[PDB]
Design an enzyme around this catalytic site. Structure first.
Site, PDB file in Angstrom:
ATOM      1  N   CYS A   1     -79.858  12.874 -83.295  1.00  0.00           N
ATOM      2  CA  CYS A   1     -80.295  14.072 -82.619  1.00  0.00           C
ATOM      3  C   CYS A   1     -81.535  13.850 -81.783  1.00  0.00           C
ATOM      4  O   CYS A   1     -82.129  14.788 -81.261  1.00  0.00           O
ATOM      5  CB  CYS A   1     -80.424  15.314 -83.453  1.00  0.00           C
ATOM      6  SG  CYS A   1     -81.581  15.510 -84.804  1.00  0.00           S
TER       7      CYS A   1
ATOM      8  N   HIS B   1     -79.305  12.756 -88.224  1.00  0.00           N
ATOM      9  CA  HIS B   1     -80.653  12.331 -88.345  1.00  0.00           C
ATOM     10  C   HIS B   1     -81.438  12.485 -87.046  1.00  0.00           C
ATOM     11  O   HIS B   1     -80.903  12.275 -85.961  1.00  0.00           O
ATOM     12  CB  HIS B   1     -80.811  10.910 -88.885  1.00  0.00           C
ATOM     13  CG  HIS B   1     -80.731   9.847 -87.827  1.00  0.00           C
ATOM     14  ND1 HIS B   1     -81.781   9.538 -86.983  1.00  0.00           N
ATOM     15  CD2 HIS B   1     -79.721   9.013 -87.491  1.00  0.00           C
ATOM     16  CE1 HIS B   1     -81.414   8.576 -86.161  1.00  0.00           C
ATOM     17  NE2 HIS B   1     -80.171   8.231 -86.458  1.00  0.00           N
ATOM     18  N   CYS B   2     -82.728  12.668 -87.213  1.00  0.00           N
ATOM     19  CA  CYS B   2     -83.693  12.634 -86.125  1.00  0.00           C
ATOM     20  C   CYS B   2     -84.754  11.595 -86.374  1.00  0.00           C
ATOM     21  O   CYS B   2     -84.522  10.492 -86.968  1.00  0.00           O
ATOM     22  CB  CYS B   2     -84.109  13.998 -85.717  1.00  0.00           C
ATOM     23  SG  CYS B   2     -83.341  14.800 -84.327  1.00  0.00           S
ATOM     24  N   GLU B   3     -86.010  11.796 -85.959  1.00  0.00           N
ATOM     25  CA  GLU B   3     -87.000  10.735 -86.230  1.00  0.00           C
ATOM     26  C   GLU B   3     -87.236  10.600 -87.731  1.00  0.00           C
ATOM     27  O   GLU B   3     -87.276   9.495 -88.266  1.00  0.00           O
ATOM     28  CB  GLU B   3     -88.306  11.014 -85.507  1.00  0.00           C
ATOM     29  CG  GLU B   3     -89.066   9.755 -85.088  1.00  0.00           C
ATOM     30  CD  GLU B   3     -90.328  10.109 -84.319  1.00  0.00           C
ATOM     31  OE1 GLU B   3     -90.360  11.212 -83.727  1.00  0.00           O
ATOM     32  OE2 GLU B   3     -91.288   9.316 -84.352  1.00  0.00           O
TER      33      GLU B   3
ATOM     34  N   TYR C   1     -84.570   7.867 -88.655  1.00  0.00           N
ATOM     35  CA  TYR C   1     -84.659   6.481 -88.192  1.00  0.00           C
ATOM     36  C   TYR C   1     -85.957   5.816 -88.621  1.00  0.00           C
ATOM     37  O   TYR C   1     -86.000   4.630 -88.936  1.00  0.00           O
ATOM     38  CB  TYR C   1     -84.556   6.459 -86.653  1.00  0.00           C
ATOM     39  CG  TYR C   1     -84.462   5.067 -86.075  1.00  0.00           C
ATOM     40  CD1 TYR C   1     -83.270   4.359 -86.134  1.00  0.00           C
ATOM     41  CD2 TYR C   1     -85.566   4.456 -85.488  1.00  0.00           C
ATOM     42  CE1 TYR C   1     -83.171   3.080 -85.615  1.00  0.00           C
ATOM     43  CE2 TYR C   1     -85.476   3.174 -84.956  1.00  0.00           C
ATOM     44  CZ  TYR C   1     -84.281   2.499 -85.034  1.00  0.00           C
ATOM     45  OH  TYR C   1     -84.164   1.231 -84.503  1.00  0.00           O
TER      46      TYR C   1
END
Length: 177
Positions: free
Chosen positions: A53, A99-101, A139
């Protein structure tokens, strides 16, 4: 299994989950992400889509191999729901991983959005994507543990000094603030 069934109440969740911010969502750890990437669930999992994302510059500076970048809600709906990604066999499963950061706010939101759209176009309680998870830590926590599963072998944070302009440019593309 000691949990409730997946979204279309057909069967139990496949993957082991870990505790995360949203008590109602299902999170998995980097380890389980690697087991899928390594084919440990190959006889049961036909396809697994990793939805990153994050904003494009973030994805370009390092992402999980095979992941797809779907940073806007409209892109995700288009990619996942216009022509559903279905298993080659009905004995098999399809699973999505968001997922994002650090998969804190944006990840959960996109996941909740796709479930709503999925509920919307199907007859209860049928779903195209009954089994969805979030990658705990995103990530940022994945990369240092399994760098060789990422491409390029690097990490670019959202708040990276040199992309303040790209972040701004990008936010102006979202449907709402």
């Amino acid at each position: 299994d000691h949990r409730e069934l997946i979204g279309d109440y057909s069967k139990a969740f496949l993957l082991q989950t870990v505790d995360g911010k949203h008590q109602d969502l299902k999170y998995i750890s980097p380890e389980t992400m690697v087991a899928l990437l390594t084919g440990k669930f190959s006889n049961i999992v036909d396809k697994f889509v990793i939805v990153d994302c994050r904003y494009p510059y973030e994805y370009e500076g390092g992402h999980i191999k095979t992941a797809v970048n779907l940073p806007l809600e409209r892109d995700a709906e288009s990619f996942l729901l216009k022509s559903p990604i279905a298993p080659c066999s009905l004995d098999k499963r399809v699973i999505l991983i968001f997922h994002c950061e650090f998969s804190s706010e944006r990840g959960p939101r996109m996941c909740r959005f796709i479930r709503e759209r999925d509920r919307a176009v199907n007859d209860y309680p049928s779903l195209y994507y009954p089994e969805m998870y979030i990658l705990k830590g995103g990530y940022k926590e994945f990369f240092p543990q399994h760098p060789n599963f990422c491409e390029p072998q690097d990490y670019r944070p959202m708040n990276h000094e040199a992309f303040k302009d790209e972040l701004k440019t990008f936010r102006l593309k979202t449907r709402s603030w």
